[PDB]
Design a protein around this ligand. Structure first.
Ligand SMILES: CN1C(=O)c2ccccc2N(C)c2nc(Nc3cnn(C4CCNCC4)c3)ncc21
Ligand SMILES: [Mg+2]
Ligand SMILES: [Mg+2]
Ligand code: NA
Length: 269
């Protein structure tokens, strides 16, 4: 049993691992019924892990929203870092999609309304996420789709981007990266809208809109297709087709912007 502030956890209760973080289920030391998740360094990548957890604290201490994973407390020292975070009892969207195969349009709408709410706050604060993918969309059941609450997670790659500036750091997951990102170009907040389009498309169809054998293959594909149109099933509703066509636009200047996204007809219906 380890303690971090008024919280505790055991390393027996592993609920996630990646190259740059390990997450354990834990609880409040006084109110044992209050569940939390404690994110820790992965010692196999100590320096980068330490950097990314520190960045996540910096960003999440400024973001409070029902559709963003909460940061209850944290502890940073010279040689260790811990985050005490919201425990999402439904796991991730990736596992949910694997089980369901595809989601209904109505479920996609409910989830995307929530993602949109979170994105409105990121956008108003001038923050870009840069690692949106189903593994980083968590679910919480307060077990039918109307009651599922979605939370964007894993803000270790997120940054402030001033509205007249562009980012250029290569980060994210290649299958969810906007063309401009994977092509090593400058990008802005609209890169995350491409990622969201990709997630929506994957929920609808069970596949990636642009399949490739490797990251390199995907990049070459984007490079050689200056006009790029996703294959959308004919049976798709007209508003969802319109949303996907506008999000999955190769050239960022032309892509759907945040105001259009937040007010898109698909999200009313
Ligand atoms: C804070 N945090 C994270 O930063 C995060 C971010 C990205 C990806 C994973 C994370 N990890 C593991 C997180 N995972 C959970 N919840 C979670 C995981 N797996 N499960 C399953 C399902 C039910 N049955 C068994 C347990 C429940 N909440 C918060 C998490
Ligand atoms: Mg991130
Ligand atoms: Mg961009
Ligand atoms: Na993609």
């Amino acid at each position: 049993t380890e303690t971090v502030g008024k919280f505790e956890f055991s390393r027996k209760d592993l609920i996630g691992h990646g190259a740059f973080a390990v997450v354990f289920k834990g609880r409040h030391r006084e109110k044992h019924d209050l569940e939390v998740a404690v994110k820790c360094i992965n010692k196999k990548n100590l320096a980068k892990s330490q950097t990314l957890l520190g960045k996540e604290i910096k960003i999440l201490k400024e973001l409070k929203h029902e559709n963003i994973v909460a940061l209850y407390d944290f502890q940073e020292m010279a040689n260790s870092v811990y985050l005490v975070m919201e425990y999402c009892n439904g796991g991730d969207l990736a596992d949910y999609l694997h089980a369901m195969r595809t989601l209904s349009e109505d479920t996609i709408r409910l989830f995307l309304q929530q993602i949109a709410g979170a994105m409105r706050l990121l956008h108003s604060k001038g923050i870009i996420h840069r690692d949106l993918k189903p593994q980083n969309i968590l679910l919480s059941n307060p077990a039918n789709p109307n009651s599922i609450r979605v939370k964007i997670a894993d803000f270790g790659f997120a940054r402030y981007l001033q509205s007249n500036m562009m980012a250029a750091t290569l980060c994210g997951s290649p299958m969810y990266m906007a063309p401009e990102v994977i092509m090593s170009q400058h990008y802005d907040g609209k890169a995350d809208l491409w990622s969201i389009g990709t997630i929506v498309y994957q929920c609808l169809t069970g596949k990636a809109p642009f399949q490739a054998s490797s990251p390199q293959d995907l990049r070459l594909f984007y490079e050689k297709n200056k006009t790029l149109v996703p294959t959308i099933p004919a049976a798709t509703s007209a508003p969802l087709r319109q949303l996907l066509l506008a999000l999955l636009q190769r050239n960022h200047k032309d892509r759907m912007d945040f105001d259009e996204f937040f007010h898109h007809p698909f999200l009313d219906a």
